[PDB]
């Protein structure tokens, strides 16, 4: 991308018929860390005491 900073901007051009032929995907996809870090029924806000 002739460079913004940490932004790689790519035009993936597949020359073949099957999508599997395309090169690797460069998108950043959504991160939901809280399904692993906060996997609890009741949210615990940072400023609260956790138990009770």
């Amino acid at each position: 991308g002739a460079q913004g900073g940490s932004t790689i901007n790519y035009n993936n051009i597949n020359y073949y018929s099957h999508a599997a032929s395309a090169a690797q995907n460069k998108q950043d996809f959504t991160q939901d860390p809280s399904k692993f870090t906060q996997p609890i029924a009741d949210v615990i806000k940072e400023t609260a005491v956790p138990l009770k």
Partner: protein, 242 residues
């Protein structure tokens, strides 16, 4: 034909190439993607999950017991509980954790780290603990008076069983080297010290266990990242697997 000039790098195979390539089964139609819980898009979602430090790495301790730092009733004031060189590389206790094992695959790191400690003594067992982070330049702090001069939290044992010492990203540069490669002087990237001290003492009712434990846990903060993939040192083989 269109006139061309193939240049240098013709016919090479680079393992990190990003090129399209002909599909050997161009008519295949894969099975649909179904919903599965826990989809991961980025390995820093794993690095932000707490894992247990193999913190009791004393010679002779084997198995599950390497995960519990001893904490005892002291007969002297201001004693030291624990000492740990802040390092994502090498082979010390951080190296076998989730964050440490991810760091084995990377060359460089940046960001804040947090250490969560859980006390395991009886309900009736009390104590106060000082957890210190010393930025680099010197040695491990020798006494609690010297360690307190750094970043530190003071932990009171109670109903809330656990504490966090956030080790903040304090650094001359935007990134550090994961490894401690000697020939390359990567000790340049020394990242400081973590020490644990008795702030008062562990106190027990008569005839209770005079020894309890801390389970140390570590994870990355949301400001953390890794660069440069590299081979994992301790995942080797001498033969093809059969």
């Amino acid at each position: 034909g269109l006139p061309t000039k193939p240049g240098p790098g013709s016919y090479q195979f680079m393992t990190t190439d990003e090129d399209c390539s002909p599909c050997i089964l161009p008519d295949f139609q894969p099975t649909p993607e179904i919903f599965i819980p826990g989809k991961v898009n980025n390995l820093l979602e794993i690095a932000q999950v707490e894992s247990i430090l193999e913190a009791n790495n004393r010679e002779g301790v084997e198995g599950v017991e390497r995960y519990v730092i001893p904490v005892s009733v002291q007969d002297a004031l201001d004693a030291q509980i624990y000492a740990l060189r802040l390092e994502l590389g090498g082979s010390g206790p951080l190296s076998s954790s989730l964050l440490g094992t991810l760091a084995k695959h990377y060359t460089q790191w940046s960001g804040s780290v947090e250490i969560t400690c859980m006390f395991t003594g009886t309900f009736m067992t009390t104590g106060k603990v000082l957890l210190a982070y010393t930025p680099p330049g010197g040695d491990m702090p020798r006494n609690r008076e010297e360690a307190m001069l750094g970043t530190h939290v003071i932990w009171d044992f109670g109903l809330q069983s656990s504490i966090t010492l956030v080790i903040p990203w304090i650094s001359a540069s935007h990134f550090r080297g994961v490894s401690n490669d000697d020939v390359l002087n990567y000790q340049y990237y020394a990242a400081g010290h973590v020490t644990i001290w008795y702030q008062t003492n562990m106190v027990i009712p008569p005839g209770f266990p005079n020894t309890a434990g801390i389970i140390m846990m570590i994870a990355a903060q949301p400001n953390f990242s890794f660069r440069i993939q590299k081979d994992r040192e301790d995942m080797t083989q001498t033969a093809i697997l059969q």
